[PDB]
Amino acid sequence: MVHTKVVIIGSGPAAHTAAIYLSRAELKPVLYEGMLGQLTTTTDIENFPGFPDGIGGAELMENMRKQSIRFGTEVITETISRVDLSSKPFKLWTEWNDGPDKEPACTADAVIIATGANARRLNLPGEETYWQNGISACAVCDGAVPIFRNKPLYVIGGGDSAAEEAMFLAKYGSSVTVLVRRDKLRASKAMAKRLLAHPKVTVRFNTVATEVLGEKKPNGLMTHLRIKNTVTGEEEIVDANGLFYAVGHDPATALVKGQIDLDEDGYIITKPGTSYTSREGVFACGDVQDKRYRQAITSAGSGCIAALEAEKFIAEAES
Amino acid sequence: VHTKVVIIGSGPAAHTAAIYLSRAELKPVLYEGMLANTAAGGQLTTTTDIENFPGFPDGIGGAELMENMRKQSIRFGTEVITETISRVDLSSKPFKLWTEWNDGPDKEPACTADAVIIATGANARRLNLPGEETYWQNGISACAVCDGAVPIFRNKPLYVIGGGDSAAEEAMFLAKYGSSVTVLVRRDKLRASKAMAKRLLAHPKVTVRFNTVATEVLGEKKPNGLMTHLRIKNTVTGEEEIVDANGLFYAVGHDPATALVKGQIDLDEDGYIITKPGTSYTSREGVFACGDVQDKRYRQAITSAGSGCIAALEAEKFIAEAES
Ligand SMILES: Cc1cc2nc3c(=O)[nH]c(=O)nc-3n(C[C@H](O)[C@H](O)[C@H](O)COP(=O)(O)OP(=O)(O)OC[C@H]3O[C@@H](n4cnc5c(N)ncnc54)[C@H](O)[C@@H]3O)c2cc1C
Ligand SMILES: Cc1cc2nc3c(=O)[nH]c(=O)nc-3n(C[C@H](O)[C@H](O)[C@H](O)COP(=O)(O)OP(=O)(O)OC[C@H]3O[C@@H](n4cnc5c(N)ncnc54)[C@H](O)[C@@H]3O)c2cc1C
C-alpha cells in the first residue's frame, strides 16, 4: 500500500506469525511474500506441536496464510528489490519497479525481515524428481521418516554440519556414509574424533554424488545413488534410500548488505532471545537470525517476538 | 527407574521438548502431575478458544490443542506419567526426583535422570472473586494479547485490575477493542514506571480509578453465561457499587512454579529461572528451562513451544557430548 505501520518481508512461519499478531492488534500490516517459504517443498511435517498425525508443509503454510489474512494482513504477491533504511520512513521497492528515480511501492515506520535461510542444494540430475522423496537437507526434520529406517543413507559435505548430521542419522539408518569431495575432513578436530569412532558411520574421502536414481511412480522414493571417485573417475551405482545435503545455508540477507549488521556467515545479528537488530526500527525473526535450530516451530516463535517488540516500538513512537 | 532426560510440566514447552527428544529416539519421561498446582495439561486447558496459534486459521480450543500435543508426544515414545514432582536433588551426578506424598525424608526417588528440562509454566494470578469460577473465560481473563480481541469485549466496557506496568500496558492494549477501559488500582498511586504511567493517564479511552477493588463478578445465569456487571468497592470509604462491565482482565503479576528448585538454579527478582538469552541454558550445567518459567516478556504458547524445542535440541546435544 501507500503507507502502513509495519511491513513484513517473507512468507515463512516467522513472517506469518508476526503478521497474525500484528494484524490482530489492529495495526494493519502488509506482508511481502514474494513472487513465489522453504517449508512449501516439504511433503509432511511431523515435529510441529498441535498436529499429532503430521501435516503437509504446503497446507501448513496455507493455514498460516489464511490465518494472517483472517485478522486483516494485506498480503501482496510481490518481491522486494531494494530497501532504503536511512530516512525517517523506510522505503521499499518492488522488483522490475526498482531504480534510482522510481517511486517506492510501500513505506512504513517499521519493517520485519523474515526472509528465511534456505539450505544449499547441488541440483544433481534426478534431484528435482526425488527432492523430499528421498533427498533432504535437515537431519532433525526428516531423519526419523520411516523411509530411511534400517536403510543405507548418504551424506554430502565435509564441514561440521556434515559430521553432526551424519552421526544423528545413525539413529535410524542401517548405515551412514559421508561423501566428502576432497580429502582431510573440513570439520572440527574434536567432533571428527567421535565421527570416525562411531560404528554405524563411514567417511568416504574423494567421492562425489553424480545422479540420484529411484522409482518412477507417483511419489517415487529414492533407491540408488551414483557416486564417482574424484581422482580415478570410476563411477558406480550403490544402494541408497536417503541423501542428505549437508553443505551450509544461504540467509536471504541480500537486501540489507551493510544497512543492518551481519555476522561472519551472513546471518542478521540480533540481540539473543530478541528480534532487535542493529538498526532501531527493523527487526529480524526466523532463519535469517537463527542458524543453530532452523525449525518452523522456533521460527514461528521468533516471529511472534518480532510482532510484539514491533508494537512496543510503534506504541512508544507515536504521539 | 532411570532415564536419559526427565521433563517436568505439561504445557506447550514441556511437550514440544518431549516431541523432539522422543523423535530423536531418546527416553524422555514427561510428568504432567496429579493436577499439579493449572491442572495437568498446561495453562491452555483453561482457555476456551486460541486464535493466535499459527496453523489453526479457524482457531482451536485450548483443551483440544494440548490433547493433540499430548498424543503427539506419546506417539514418538514419551513415557508420560501423570504424577507430581515434590522434591528434586540436583547435587549428585544423577538428578533425583520424588513424587508428591511419596517424598519422605529417607525415601527412594521415583525417577532419576542425567538431564532435566524445566517447563513447569508460570500461571497468572487470580483474585478468587465470587462469581469468578462462573464467568472465567466467559468474561474474565488474564492475558490482554490473547483474549482482548474476542468479540464479546469489542465495543463494551472493560475493566483492568492492577497498578503495575503490566496493568498499564494491558489496559492501553484493551483500548483497541472495548468501548471504555477502566483500571482499578488498589492503593492511591500507580506502582508502574513514570513513563508508562505518562502514556496511561494520557490515553483518552482509559480512566484510572485509584483506591478501588473489584469485589464480585455478576452476569447472566445460563449455561454459558457471559459477564454483565462488576461490583467495585472504594477502599477508603468502603462503599461498594455495581457498574456495567463485560470484561474483567487480571493484570497482577505471575507465579512461576519454581518452588521445587528454590536455590539450586539461579532465579531472578520476580521468581523466573534465569537462562542464557536465546537458549535454555540455566545456571547449573545439566538442567535446562523452557517456557514461561524463563519467559517474562512474551508469555505466549507459540513462544513457549518454540523455547521448548530450544531446550530439546540443547538437551540432546548435551547428552551426545557426554557419552562420546
Ligand atoms: C528440505 C527442508 C525441510 C524442512 N523440514 C522441516 C520440518 O519437517 N519441520 C520444521 O519445523 N521445519 C522444517 N524446515 C525448516 C523450514 O525452513 C522452516 O520453515 C524455517 O525454519 C522457517 O524459516 P522462516 O520462518 O524464517 O521463513 P521461510 O520458511 O524460510 O520463508 C522464506 C520466505 O522468504 C521470502 N522472501 C525471501 N526474500 C524475499 C524478498 N526480497 N522479497 C519478498 N519475499 C522474500 C520468500 O518468498 C520465502 O517464501 C525444513 C527446511 C528445509 C530446507
Ligand atoms: C486466561 C489465559 C489465556 C491464555 N490464552 C492464550 C492464547 O490464546 N494463545 C497463546 O499462545 N497463549 C495463551 N496463554 C498463555 C499460556 O499460559 C501459555 O500456555 C504459556 O505461555 C505457556 O505455558 P508453558 O509451556 O510455559 O507451561 P504451562 O502450560 O503454563 O504449565 C505446565 C504444566 O505443568 C504442570 N506442573 C507444574 N508443576 C508440576 C510438577 N512438579 N510436576 C508435574 N507437573 C507439574 C502444571 O499442571 C502446569 O500447568 C493464556 C494464558 C492465560 C492465563
Q: How far from chain centre, in Å, is Cα A114? A: 10
CB A212 within 8 A of CB A237: no
- A289 assigned binding-site residue: no
CA distances from A142 to A55, A288, B30 (A): 13, 21, 24
Backbone dihedral angles phi then psi of residue B163, each to the nearest 5 degrees = -125, 0
Task: Determine the Cα–Cα distance for residues B126 and B122; give it in Å rounded to an integer.
Answer: 12
- The angle at the Cα of A105, spanning A99 to A111, to the nearest 5 degrees, equals 105
Whole-angstrom distance, CA of residue A70 vs CA of residue A66: 6
- The dihedral built from the CA positions of residue A303, A304, A306 and A307, taken in this order, carries a sign that is positive
Euclidean distance between CA atoms B139 and A21, whole angstroms: 21
Q: Around Cβ A57, how many Cβ atoms within 10 Å?
A: 21
Residue type, A301: G
Q: Around Cβ B48, how many Cβ atoms within 10 Å?
A: 15
Count CB atoms within 10 A of the CB of residue B41. 22
What CA–CA distance (Å, rounded) separates B313 from B320? Answer: 11
Q: Where are the beta strands (DSSP E) in chain A?
A: 3-9, 30-32, 74-76, 80-84, 90-94, 106-113, 117-119, 135-136, 152-156, 175-179, 201-204, 207-214, 222-229, 235-239, 242-245, 249-251, 282-284
Which of the 8 DSSP states describes residue A301? H
Mention every residue, 6+ apart, whose C-beta is less than 8 A from residue B324. Answer: A194, A197, A198
Radius of gyration, alpha carbons of chain A: 22
B54 vs A67, A168, A194: nearest CB: A67
Contacts for B73 with CB less than 8 Å, ≥ 6 apart? B15, B18, B19, B22, B30, B80
Task: Please answer yes or no on whether A49 and B72 come within 8 Å at the CB atom.
Answer: yes
Interface of B with A in 212-271 (CB under 8 A): none
Chain A nearest C-alpha distance from B16 (Å)? 6
CB crowding B81-108: b at 16 or more within 10 Å, else e = bebbbbbbebeeeebbbbbeeeeeeeee
CB neighbours of B300 closer than 8 A, spacing ≥ 6? A301, A304, B52, B145, B146
Give contacts of A 127-186 with B, CB under 8 A: 140, 144, 167-168, 171-172
Query: What one-character-per-residue DSSP string does A23-40 give?
Result: HHTT---EEE-----GGG
Are the Cβ atoms of A295 and B302 closer than 8 angstroms?
no
Residue B95, beta-bridge partner list: B113
What is the Cα Rg of chain B in Å? 21
Is-contact B175 B148, C-beta < 8 A?
Answer: no
Q: What angle do CA B193, B198, B201 make, to 5 degrees?
A: 115
B38 touches chain A (CB under 8 A): no
Ligand 2 nearest-atom number relative to CA B299: 21
Residues 6+ apart with CB under 8 A from B163: B183, B185, B186, B187, B189, B190, B191, B192
Query: What is the C-alpha separation between B118 and B288, in angstroms, rounded?
Result: 6
CA distance B242 to chain A (A): 30
Residue with cell 474474565: B140
- Nearest residue to B20 via CA among A248, A201, A298, A40: A298
Q: A132 near A26, Cβ under 8 Å?
A: no
Residue of chain A whose alpha carbon sits nearest to that of B12:
A49
Q: What is the resolution of this structure in A?
A: 3.2
Question: What's the DSSP call for residue A258?
Answer: T
Q: Which spans in A33-148 are helix H?
A: 57-70, 127-130, 139-142
Whole-angstrom distance, CA of residue A284 vs CA of residue A114: 6
Ligand 2 touching residue B31 (CB < 6 A): yes
For chain B, first and last CA: distance in Å? 23
Closest CA to B96 of B114, B78, B83: B114
Cell of A253: 540477507
Cell of B246: 463485560
Sort out which chain B residues have CB atoms less than 8 A from A316's CB and list them. Answer: 199
- Closest to B248 measured CA to CA, from B164, B135, B99, B154: B135
Distance from CA of B169 to the nearest CA of A (A): 10
Ligand 1 binding pocket includes A294 (Cβ within 6 Å): yes
Burial class (CB in 10 A: 0-12, 13-18, 19+), B211: middle
Residue nearest to atom 11 of ligand 1 (CA): A296
| Phi-psi sector, B120: left (phi>0), alpha (psi -120 to 50), beta | alpha
Tell me, what amino acid is at A206? Answer: N
Question: Do strands B287-289 and B111-118 pair parallel, antiparallel, or not at all (unpaired)?
Answer: parallel
Question: B148 has which bridge partners?
Answer: none
Task: Report the distance separating Cα B18 and Cα B72, nearest Å.
Answer: 9
CB B295 within 8 A of CB B304: yes
The CA distance from B283 to B265, in Å, is 6
Is A240 annotated as belonging to a binding site? no
**Residue A184: HSE in the Cβ half-sphere, 13 Å Cα cutoff:** 0
- Does A263 count as an annotated binding residue? no
| Contact in structure between A166 and A187 (CB atoms under 8 Å) | no
Q: What type of residue is A49?
A: P
Signed CA dihedral, A273, B124, B163, A25: sign only? positive
Q: For residue B32, give the ligand 2 atom closest to its CA.
A: 44
Nearest-angstrom CA–CA distance, B289 and B32: 16
CB B27 within 8 A of CB B3: yes
